[PDB]
Design an enzyme around this catalytic site. Structure first.
Site, PDB file in Angstrom:
ATOM      1  N   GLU A 212      38.359  36.032  48.447  1.00 61.70           N
ATOM      2  CA  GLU A 212      36.894  36.720  48.968  1.00 61.70           C
ATOM      3  C   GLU A 212      37.385  37.749  49.934  1.00 61.70           C
ATOM      4  O   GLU A 212      36.496  37.641  51.183  1.00 61.70           O
ATOM      5  CB  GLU A 212      35.757  35.817  49.486  1.00 61.70           C
ATOM      6  CG  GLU A 212      35.233  34.598  48.464  1.00 61.70           C
ATOM      7  CD  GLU A 212      34.176  34.299  48.431  1.00 61.70           C
ATOM      8  OE1 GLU A 212      33.490  34.455  49.501  1.00 61.70           O
ATOM      9  OE2 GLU A 212      33.646  33.339  47.535  1.00 61.70           O
TER      10      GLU A 212
ATOM     11  N   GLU B  44      35.755  29.995  41.574  1.00 64.46           N
ATOM     12  CA  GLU B  44      34.568  29.089  42.029  1.00 64.46           C
ATOM     13  C   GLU B  44      33.274  29.143  41.304  1.00 64.46           C
ATOM     14  O   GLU B  44      32.870  30.254  41.033  1.00 64.46           O
ATOM     15  CB  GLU B  44      34.364  29.492  43.429  1.00 64.46           C
ATOM     16  CG  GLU B  44      35.493  28.970  44.553  1.00 64.46           C
ATOM     17  CD  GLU B  44      35.262  29.451  45.977  1.00 64.46           C
ATOM     18  OE1 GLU B  44      34.088  29.618  46.380  1.00 64.46           O
ATOM     19  OE2 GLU B  44      36.183  29.785  46.724  1.00 64.46           O
TER      20      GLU B  44
ATOM     21  N   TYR C  38      28.324  32.835  41.710  1.00 67.65           N
ATOM     22  CA  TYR C  38      27.358  31.798  42.212  1.00 67.65           C
ATOM     23  C   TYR C  38      25.918  32.415  41.737  1.00 67.65           C
ATOM     24  O   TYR C  38      25.181  31.434  41.218  1.00 67.65           O
ATOM     25  CB  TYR C  38      27.253  31.374  43.706  1.00 67.65           C
ATOM     26  CG  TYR C  38      28.603  30.966  44.191  1.00 67.65           C
ATOM     27  CD1 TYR C  38      29.644  31.476  44.634  1.00 67.65           C
ATOM     28  CD2 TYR C  38      28.488  29.264  44.198  1.00 67.65           C
ATOM     29  CE1 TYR C  38      30.838  30.793  45.176  1.00 67.65           C
ATOM     30  CE2 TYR C  38      29.765  28.702  44.546  1.00 67.65           C
ATOM     31  CZ  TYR C  38      30.888  29.440  44.997  1.00 67.65           C
ATOM     32  OH  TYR C  38      31.966  28.724  45.706  1.00 67.65           O
TER      33      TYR C  38
ATOM     34  N   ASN D  53      34.949  34.451  42.026  1.00 65.24           N
ATOM     35  CA  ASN D  53      33.799  33.534  42.734  1.00 65.24           C
ATOM     36  C   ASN D  53      32.518  33.814  42.428  1.00 65.24           C
ATOM     37  O   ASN D  53      32.240  34.686  42.899  1.00 65.24           O
ATOM     38  CB  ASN D  53      34.145  33.265  44.174  1.00 65.24           C
ATOM     39  CG  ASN D  53      35.554  32.809  44.491  1.00 65.24           C
ATOM     40  OD1 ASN D  53      36.287  32.536  43.630  1.00 65.24           O
ATOM     41  ND2 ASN D  53      35.783  32.634  45.747  1.00 65.24           N
TER      42      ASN D  53
ATOM     43  N   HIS E 288      42.985  31.606  52.714  1.00 63.77           N
ATOM     44  CA  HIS E 288      41.461  31.221  52.598  1.00 63.77           C
ATOM     45  C   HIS E 288      41.017  31.323  53.916  1.00 63.77           C
ATOM     46  O   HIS E 288      40.521  30.296  54.636  1.00 63.77           O
ATOM     47  CB  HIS E 288      41.218  29.825  52.034  1.00 63.77           C
ATOM     48  CG  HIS E 288      40.142  29.792  51.192  1.00 63.77           C
ATOM     49  ND1 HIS E 288      38.862  30.076  52.093  1.00 63.77           N
ATOM     50  CD2 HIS E 288      39.669  29.468  50.136  1.00 63.77           C
ATOM     51  CE1 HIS E 288      37.660  29.502  51.095  1.00 63.77           C
ATOM     52  NE2 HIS E 288      38.363  29.472  49.872  1.00 63.77           N
TER      53      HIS E 288
END
Length: 478
Positions: free
Chosen positions: A168, A384, A311, A309, A122
């Site tokens: 990511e 996420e 958003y 992930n 990460h």
């Protein structure tokens, strides 16, 4: 309203964290320096001039935080291992205190009935490897990462059954090597004056290639040596905005599709089909590395699950770089698109604190269907999803706890997620909220509060539950 019954039996709910953003104790128990230690201690790199030397001190306070998770009935916790706590120099001497630390964390989680979902990388590469060979720029990173991964499989794989090799890679390749806004802060100096070195046209593609090979190398070790006895699974967490056409024209419809290929497909097409997307080959040409046949054979099929992930959602239009002007290659130019949260001056939705984070719940459903269709229904975890509040010194802590906007966010995104599963047949296995605690949000520092729990940075990192804590508790009640 939503209940556990809104999702498949066995659906996993959790919260997510990352080592550098949470742990603190940066010089404790043998931990080696990382590229983010260097970046955070360099002028101009962190917007609020802060660092994560202490962060929220989860290195010492993890048992308290485990109780705060169990208080909501969480099934799992996503956390990362700091590579520099296991190998302070990236390779070489193993740091037993790092092993002992994560064993304590893993055992503490399991004793509370919370399953560990472990991210190996990460973003905190050991600085020793950056100095040795410029880190992700060198093919040596592949074997070095795989060796680190193996050590984690050996030490923790008897208990950890869910592995996320990389977080990511798209973000890292672009932000780290095109924009130079994240560590190691490289880019074409002619495009961004603040960078000390780099090449925005070439380096992101080299880094991405090496991420893909590094994952495949670790997956090969896992499948050949550990999977039969440990019975776990390996995936990757991909950063994925949804893209909608900026206009109802085939040119913009195709542009949104292309923007998706350059974001997700850049990584996922290799893992599912053995090569980069055709659009990328066409547009990036010789700057896009080629897999050998033996590499394609280790890369294709290397995921057990897809971590998303997710958003936000932007509009995308077709774009041609200026025909007259000095061409300075870069990844956005290569896409032949521009993606923005505005159409005809109007935003796509309400915004959270983060300037990039627009609230567009339907994007969750659209993206789930996209992944199902393109990649033949792989198992997906939402690794996420969440949103942030400002860090507002002009309001009381009590007022800071009233996160109704976050509650609406989770409600609306989860409602869309539940519909993608029940109505649309998407194979989604779990969901992790970003984040359990307010934390150090990289170059945004402490200016962004993503947590279900508020952290009082002015009162010895005291945790207070925001209203979303009770919302999740009610949701997860069994």
């Amino acid at each position: 309203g939503l209940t556990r019954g809104s999702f498949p039996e066995g659906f996993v709910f959790g919260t997510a964290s990352a080592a550098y953003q949470y742990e603190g104790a940066v010089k404790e128990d043998g931990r080696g320096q990382t590229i983010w230690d260097t970046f955070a201690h360099t002028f101009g790199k962190i917007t609020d001039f802060s660092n994560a030397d202490v962060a929220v001190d989860q290195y010492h306070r993890f048992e308290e935080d485990i109780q705060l998770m169990a208080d909501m009935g969480m099934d799992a916790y996503r956390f990362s291992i700091a590579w520099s706590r296991i190998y302070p120099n990236g390779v070489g001497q193993v740091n037993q205190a790092g092993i002992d630390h994560y064993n304590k964390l893993i055992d503490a989680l399991l004793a509370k009935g919370i399953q560990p979902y472990v991210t190996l990388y990460h973003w905190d590469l050991p600085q020793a490897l950056e100095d040795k060979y410029k880190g992700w720029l060198d093919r040596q990173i592949v074997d070095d990462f795989a060796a680190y991964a193996e050590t984690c499989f050996r030490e923790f794989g008897d208990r950890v059954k869910h592995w996320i090799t990389l977080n990511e890679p798209h973000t890292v390749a672009i932000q780290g090597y095109d924009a130079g806004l994240q560590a190691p802060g490289r880019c074409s100096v002619l495009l961004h004056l603040y960078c000390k070195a780099g090449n925005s046209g070439t380096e992101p593609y080299v880094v991405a290639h090496h991420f893909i090979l590094a994952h495949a190398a670790a997956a090969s070790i896992y499948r050949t040596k550990y999977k039969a006895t440990q019975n776990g699974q390996l995936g990757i967490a991909f950063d994925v905005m949804w893209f909608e056409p900026m206009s109802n024209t085939t040119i913009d419809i195709e542009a949104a599709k292309r923007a998706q290929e350059f974001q997700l497909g850049w990584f996922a097409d290799p893992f599912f089909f053995g090569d980069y997307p055709a659009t990328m080959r066409a547009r990036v040409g010789e700057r896009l590395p080629r897999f050998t046949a033996d590499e394609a054979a280790v890369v294709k099929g290397a995921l057990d699950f897809v971590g998303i992930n997710h958003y936000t959602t932007y509009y995308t239009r077709h774009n041609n770089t200026n025909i007259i002007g000095t061409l300075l290659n870069n990844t956005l130019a290569d896409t032949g698109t521009v993606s923005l949260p505005f159409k005809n001056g109007k935003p796509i939705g309400d915004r959270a604190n983060s300037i990039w984070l627009y609230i567009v719940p339907r994007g969750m459903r659209s993206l789930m269907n996209y992944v199902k269709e393109r990649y033949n229904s792989p198992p997906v975890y939402i690794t996420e999803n969440g949103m942030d509040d400002s860090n507002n010194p002009f309001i009381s802590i009590k007022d800071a706890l009233k996160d109704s906007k976050r509650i609406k966010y989770h409600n609306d995104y989860l409602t869309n997620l539940a519909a993608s599963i029940k109505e649309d047949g998407c194979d989604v296995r779990g969901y992790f909220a970003w984040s359990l605690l307010d934390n150090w949000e990289w170059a945004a520092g402490y200016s962004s509060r993503f947590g279900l729990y508020f952290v009082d940075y002015k009162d010895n990192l005291k945790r207070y539950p925001k209203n979303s804590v009770q919302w999740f508790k009610a949701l997860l009640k069994t």
